[PDB]
Symmetry: C5
Subunit: 28 residues, 5 copies
Amino acid sequence: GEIAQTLKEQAKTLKEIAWTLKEIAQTL
Amino acid sequence: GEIAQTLKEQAKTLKEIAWTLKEIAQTLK
Amino acid sequence: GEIAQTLKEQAKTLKEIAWTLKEIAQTLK
Amino acid sequence: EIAQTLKEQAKTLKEIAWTLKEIAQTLK
Amino acid sequence: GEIAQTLKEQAKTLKEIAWTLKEIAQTLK
């Protein structure tokens, strides 16, 4: 349902954010 | 309702955060 | 109540994070 | 529980916000 | 259950995000 799906989308986006930040940290 | 809408707002803000971070990463690659 | 308020606080903090990141991105563009 | 997970999330988000402010400050 | 677990996963990811940001801040201070 809508709530479950929103939470899953949030989790997915958070993983992307975490990965991009790791890439940024790596270069510094 | 209020809970559903808060969660949707959170999801939207997270997408913006993800996009801005991609822009930042792009310039540093 | 407590759950609703926590979620609202989370949403607010996410917006702050998004704004600060936009500031960071702006200087690097 | 759920309440506790949400509280932990809120706390972590505050730390994230603070660290980002520190980062932004040095670049300002 | 599924909701509880999603929230726990989110919390874990947020901890990773917090740590990486601390590393970034450390190099810039």
